[PDB]
Amino acid sequence: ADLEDNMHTLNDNLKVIEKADNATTVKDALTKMQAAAQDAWSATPPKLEDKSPDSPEMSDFRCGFWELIGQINAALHLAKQGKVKEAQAAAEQLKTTCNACHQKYR
Amino acid sequence: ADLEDNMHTLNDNLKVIEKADNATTVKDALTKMQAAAQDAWSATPPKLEDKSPDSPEMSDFRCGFWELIGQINAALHLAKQGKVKEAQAAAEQLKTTCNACHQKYR
Amino acid sequence: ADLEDNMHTLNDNLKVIEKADNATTVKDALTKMQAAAQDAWSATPPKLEDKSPDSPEMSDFRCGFWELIGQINAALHLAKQGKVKEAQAAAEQLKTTCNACHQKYR
Amino acid sequence: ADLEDNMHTLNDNLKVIEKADNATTVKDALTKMQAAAQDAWSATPPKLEDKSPDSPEMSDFRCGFWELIGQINAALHLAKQGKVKEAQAAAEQLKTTCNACHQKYR
Amino acid sequence: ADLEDNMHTLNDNLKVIEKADNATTVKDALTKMQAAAQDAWSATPPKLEDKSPDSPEMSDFRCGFWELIGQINAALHLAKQGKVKEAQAAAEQLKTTCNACHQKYR
Amino acid sequence: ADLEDNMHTLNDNLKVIEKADNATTVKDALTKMQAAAQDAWSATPPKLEDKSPDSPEMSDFRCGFWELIGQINAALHLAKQGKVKEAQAAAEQLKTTCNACHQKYR
Amino acid sequence: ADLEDNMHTLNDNLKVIEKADNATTVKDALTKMQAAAQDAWSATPPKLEDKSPDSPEMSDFRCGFWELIGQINAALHLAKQGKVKEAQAAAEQLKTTCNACHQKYR
Amino acid sequence: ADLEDNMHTLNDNLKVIEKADNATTVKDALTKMQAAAQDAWSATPPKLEDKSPDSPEMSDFRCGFWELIGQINAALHLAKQGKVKEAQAAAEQLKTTCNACHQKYR
Amino acid sequence: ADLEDNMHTLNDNLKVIEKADNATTVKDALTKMQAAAQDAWSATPPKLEDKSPDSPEMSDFRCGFWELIGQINAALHLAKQGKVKEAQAAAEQLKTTCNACHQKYR
Amino acid sequence: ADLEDNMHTLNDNLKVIEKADNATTVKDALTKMQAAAQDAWSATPPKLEDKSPDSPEMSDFRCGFWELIGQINAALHLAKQGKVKEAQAAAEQLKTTCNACHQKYR
Amino acid sequence: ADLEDNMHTLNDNLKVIEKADNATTVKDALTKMQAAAQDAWSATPPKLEDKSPDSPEMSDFRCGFWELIGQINAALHLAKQGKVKEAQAAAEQLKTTCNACHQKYR
Amino acid sequence: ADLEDNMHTLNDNLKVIEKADNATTVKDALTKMQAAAQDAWSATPPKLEDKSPDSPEMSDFRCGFWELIGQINAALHLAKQGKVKEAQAAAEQLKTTCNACHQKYR
Ligand code: HEC
Ligand code: HEC
Ligand code: HEC
Ligand code: HEC
Ligand code: HEC
Ligand code: HEC
Ligand code: HEC
Ligand code: HEC
Ligand code: HEC
Ligand code: HEC
Ligand code: HEC
Ligand code: HEC
């Protein structure tokens, strides 16, 4: 998957997460996100095509995915316990990371 | 994944395939369509919910999926061989099986 | 397992599913049922031993089994989500499929 | 494997089946057929190159492989029990499906 | 599975074993009996709930189950060696174990 | 792990189970208790080293551990079914087992 | 393996352990002893065939085997920790178990 | 496991590692510690629940965990080589990392 | 593998990649660099041995590896797609991340 | 598979390879030749049945297979790299090892 | 296992195979023999410790082992087919290979 | 890997072997050699590019790798027992095979 494909995947499964009524739908959504983020953190966004890889921009970009992956895991921790409303809340809090990286680098 | 979830998956991956430039991307997108159609065949569409599980439209519905699952495999055969533009021509040709079921039951 | 033992398995797990009070017992009963039905779909029933493998009755006998596994998958989908009562109700609708085969071929 | 390769495989292992004197030779032959049929049912025969995939010809073609796979499984059921003569008989009965599809579509 | 479910499972496979005509079928019945006796040994029978788990009754009840699992393993030993009649005679013999626990705690 | 390590492990997970608010957390605590009780049953307590392994003390010490592993398995049965409160009441009950062995060999 | 085969296996690995000069070799000998003692505990010795499986003799015979498997597990514990001499002294000690059952049922 | 239970696990295995006399106990303690720290790196500590997921404190909290797993990997590297005392000494240096996090965030 | 062992691995595989003529060779060499960098991130370089595990140079060191591990994944993404000369241009570009860390800490 | 069974396999797959247009087909055919030659090396040809297992013709026979198994691996190396016409030139060159053994022992 | 223990294993399983009454005991004895012979083919016998690794005697010693595994594979091939007496007779021919090595090198 | 790549691998790990101070470093080095030799024995050296594959040169070349693989296994046998000095000695003795094949065919 390219970068855009993986963003589309995270976004879709985020929508599945809010629509869900049970923990298994949520669990499986989060796992697909977890795979899209893993495939994506090594990508280079078009806005950073002329930075060296070592620049603080590109390492802040990598930092955004690791923070994203951290809270995806936190949401999965809740889902695997059956706490559907608490997982949906945790998944909502994930958008702060989404937006922060979008403001700077998208 | 409910039925429309998996319909959305099929649609997204049709779009990934038409724009790809390698067989790896195409292969993986096909594999996801395979997963989606397997989760979808045992579902009752809304417009068929009041007709018996034996009825010929329920048989004709689940027959449509195995025809789809067939041509996905066929396309997947071409992609596993590196034949990327023929795997893409087979994915383009998947739409007439999509339309046929849609005209009848969507 | 022979055909008669698979049928007795299918029937055992309907009682299990109906008396169940949690989703784990239901998913496991529905999993054994999928096992018994997979093994039984290739069998030859006493009253069709007379007949050709490509006869209409044998093609229909087999096709009645593809529809039972279908509905068993749908009910497993609910049970995996923790919806025990929806799972119970979907399994009770399965007896439409048992009856339609029995009338023709038992 | 192309379609012809897989037909050659089924035919060879069918010959191995009649030559056999033990259940393991038979079991392993049937398993190779089972894989050739799986690889083959999504193929398009030259005689159906101009039918749409949804036509009753192509779905009857798919139907022939599923009936074939059903009795391969039945033969394997016998072989895995040690019943060598009964498996060889079941494997012989498979030729009806072979011939029926050959008459129409080969 | 509760205790009663696993008892019915033991019963069913005793019948399956007596009518079997090959070793594969007895082995699988013995395998399922083993899985049943393993889930059941830690359960509490209705007539021993009013009692501490370290009482000799709970100890003798668990003792009966390990006696049963040994006789199933011995029978499974013979079945894995193709001795259908010997394993069948062994399965019949362990009825003496089922009965011993029954006129005690059932 | 020595015997003392596994005792501390048993103790920790009893506390974890009493404060849990979901089934996933009790199941894992029970799973770890099982792994602990399995490593510990073949150990020799300090007050039974001066003794042959076939003495009734070593036999009753090992007897206590199999009593414990049964009660953990019964509790694990309820937890796997989502019955958090029942499994929690079951975990509390097996404290009677921990104490019985303790005022004997500790 | 019959009972006698597994006895010879126990004997061989006792000798292998006494002459070993490292932990890997004792661990594997203890592992094979474990596999031997597991296959053997459900067998019936020649001098206890004239007897019901719930007699104290069959119960004490099976009791001896669980005593043995515990001492092998304790020795395996030390070997996995690299304590060759301690595991070697532990293997020698369980000769007292082999002898106890022998002047009883052999 | 919650954050507090993972911390109690991390602390348990430091005592295990310090009192250990072989490399197998150390590698296994260090493996449990890696488990507890992996599960805890995505948690939210009481005193930061107030705060944004992309706040400096949460980014720092997470980053303090990447350094603890790092050092735990290094100590596992030694323990896997059988260097128990070097492994013990590397683990005792781990408390620099525990302290630096506790001062800021406990 | 100590730190210089894994540095040597990275260097050798950089040379394999520049001279390869297929993506399989490049893919596998990249996978080995992945393994090497995973074993290397948790190591303390000599010139940093006296600075605290918290120090910003230790953080800046282990940050450098994840930047390297990132671009290896990125190159590995291109190789898995068959893009051999672009996977090689990405491996050529890996050197500026090598130099950057070397100028600072080698 | 008896010896002539596996000879037939080798022959069929030589023909698949010469006509293929991709490395996937060639790879899989080579993998099947690998399986066939592994099953075939430990067989005694008819014209060598009365010569001792030590005899130099039995040694020279089983030496011929490892020479064949070698060049199959070598061809398989080229196919795994995508070099389809060089993998096919190596498969064409396999025949001189076939002929050499045939002239001597067929 | 050392060379002498592997030989004692090889000899143990010949007696097992000769006294066996079913194909399962034979296949399992022949499997242990293949294990012992695989581990022993790289050993150095007492009377060749004097000698070079590329000496004619060591090359011959090793080559005598490739022929023993060969014949053990052939006998396993029969035992896997349920031909216990043919398997027994093929194993009794194995002692030609044991003798030829012993005369030269024991 | 080409032939030269694999020779470089064996040589590197041989250097790691003499530098090592523990059995795990040695074990892992030998395993990487074992894989390089496996990948290499089917190769054709430049000096034998004009020999037929069946010539005694090319089969002596294959013979050199099998002797090499035999002693790599012997060294691994020692390493897996913890005998580091004895494994380093066995690994040193391997150079005779290296040199012998280098004199003739390199
Ligand atoms: C940086 C660390 C990011 C994080 C965290 C997330 N996204 Fe993102 N996103 C990012 C970039 C650099 C881009 C631009 C890609 C490009 O090719 O220009 C995007 C884009 C998207 C899109 C648009 C997809 C498309 O069709 O082009 C979507 C739908 C999207 N992003 C969604 C999304 C969600 C839901 C996230 C959190 C769960 C998220 N992104 C995080 C960079 C980063
Ligand atoms: C029957 C055998 C079908 C085949 C083959 C395909 N689709 Fe489908 N589709 C089907 C139904 C019954 C429905 C309605 C489902 C509902 O719950 O209302 C759909 C719907 C879609 C949608 C929209 C989903 C939504 O927004 O609710 C899409 C985008 C879609 N289908 C796409 C699609 C594609 C791309 C297919 C083949 C490649 C395809 N469908 C096949 C039934 C069937
Ligand atoms: C055909 C496609 C069938 C479907 C679907 C189901 N059943 Fe069936 N069943 C079928 C036949 C032809 C027979 C008779 C076979 C014979 O040898 O007589 C049966 C038998 C049963 C039985 C009695 C079995 C016995 O112990 O003798 C039962 C209890 C039974 N079947 C139950 C059952 C249930 C609950 C089903 C749906 C879940 C079901 N069957 C489906 C053919 C077919
Ligand atoms: C349809 C559902 C089929 C079934 C069932 C079987 N076969 Fe078939 N076969 C089929 C077709 C459409 C063709 C023509 C392929 C082509 O490229 O034109 C064939 C051909 C064969 C062949 C010839 C192989 C060749 O070298 O071209 C053989 C040997 C063959 N088929 C054998 C065979 C056997 C043994 C079957 C049952 C076990 C069998 N076929 C089933 C279609 C179908
Ligand atoms: C104790 C050590 C037992 C052994 C060994 C066997 N059985 Fe059992 N059985 C036992 C109890 C305590 C009960 C009552 C459980 C309850 O909840 O009431 C039973 C019951 C049965 C039943 C009746 C189930 C029903 O739904 O009516 C059957 C059919 C049964 N048991 C069968 C059975 C078989 C076949 C056994 C040996 C193979 C066997 N039991 C052993 C206690 C014990
Ligand atoms: C015997 C059959 C026992 C059972 C069941 C349980 N315990 Fe145990 N316990 C036992 C002994 C012989 C000892 C002494 C071991 C020694 O080496 O001295 C113990 C000790 C404990 C301890 C103290 C550990 C410490 O480091 O001080 C604890 C906390 C403990 N045991 C807990 C415990 C729990 C929670 C149990 C049930 C779930 C349990 N024990 C059962 C013997 C036996
Ligand atoms: C019962 C609880 C036993 C334990 C523990 C051990 N042995 Fe055993 N042994 C037992 C019996 C009933 C028999 C007779 C079996 C028969 O079929 O006659 C034996 C026999 C042996 C033998 C002789 C085998 C032969 O072929 O002659 C040996 C060498 C032997 N046993 C060894 C052995 C060892 C080494 C044990 C402990 C590690 C051991 N036995 C324990 C009963 C029991
Ligand atoms: C942050 C990155 C931390 C690291 C690294 C370590 N600890 Fe920690 N720990 C942290 C917090 C924020 C807290 C308090 C959480 C709360 O809910 O109050 C803790 C707590 C502990 C405790 C007490 C746990 C309890 O049972 O209440 C202990 C014993 C503890 N921590 C130990 C510990 C050790 C040994 C560490 C290094 C190996 C370590 N912690 C690292 C935050 C962080
Ligand atoms: C830090 C984040 C580094 C990155 C990225 C790379 N290297 Fe490295 N390298 C680093 C250090 C601290 C050292 C010194 C280690 C020591 O123990 O002294 C090295 C050393 C090397 C060496 C020589 C090793 C030796 O002979 O002792 C080589 C050949 C080397 N490094 C190569 C190399 C390559 C090819 C890299 C990227 C592709 C690379 N290094 C990255 C620290 C870091
Ligand atoms: C010895 C080292 C051999 C090598 C290399 C190959 N073959 Fe072989 N082949 C060999 C023998 C001893 C026999 C006779 C077996 C018998 O039981 O009579 C054969 C036979 C064949 C056959 C015909 C089999 C039959 O119909 O009975 C074929 C088609 C064949 N061989 C093909 C073949 C190919 C294609 C090879 C390399 C690619 C090859 N053989 C190698 C011995 C040896
Ligand atoms: C060389 C290639 C051999 C083959 C093939 C077989 N044996 Fe062997 N064996 C060989 C040697 C060099 C030795 C002596 C090693 C020593 O340290 O003295 C042996 C030894 C035995 C023994 C005695 C083992 C002992 O306990 O001391 C036995 C019982 C034995 N060998 C049996 C045996 C059998 C049955 C074989 C064929 C299946 C066989 N050996 C093959 C060398 C070789
Ligand atoms: C034949 C059976 C060989 C054995 C055993 C070993 N090596 Fe070798 N080596 C061999 C050949 C034919 C060649 C030439 C390759 C070429 O392309 O010309 C080599 C070469 C090497 C090299 C040089 C690598 C390079 O950069 O070209 C090295 C470092 C090497 N060989 C090392 C080596 C070691 C350490 C061995 C034993 C463990 C060993 N070789 C065995 C053939 C054979």
Ligand SMILES: [Fe+3]
């Ligand atoms: Fe139909």
Ligand SMILES: [Fe+3]
């Ligand atoms: Fe008792």
Ligand SMILES: [Fe+3]
């Ligand atoms: Fe940072």
Ligand SMILES: [Fe+3]
């Ligand atoms: Fe030779």
Ligand SMILES: [Zn+2]
């Ligand atoms: Zn991707």
Ligand SMILES: [Zn+2]
């Ligand atoms: Zn989408």
Ligand SMILES: [Zn+2]
């Ligand atoms: Zn779904």
Ligand SMILES: [Zn+2]
């Ligand atoms: Zn069956």
Ligand SMILES: [Zn+2]
């Ligand atoms: Zn029943």
Ligand SMILES: [Zn+2]
């Ligand atoms: Zn194919």
Ligand SMILES: [Zn+2]
């Ligand atoms: Zn053929």
Ligand SMILES: [Zn+2]
């Ligand atoms: Zn249960």
Ligand SMILES: [Zn+2]
């Ligand atoms: Zn332990």
Ligand SMILES: [Zn+2]
């Ligand atoms: Zn046995």
Ligand SMILES: [Zn+2]
């Ligand atoms: Zn957790």
Ligand SMILES: [Zn+2]
């Ligand atoms: Zn604790």
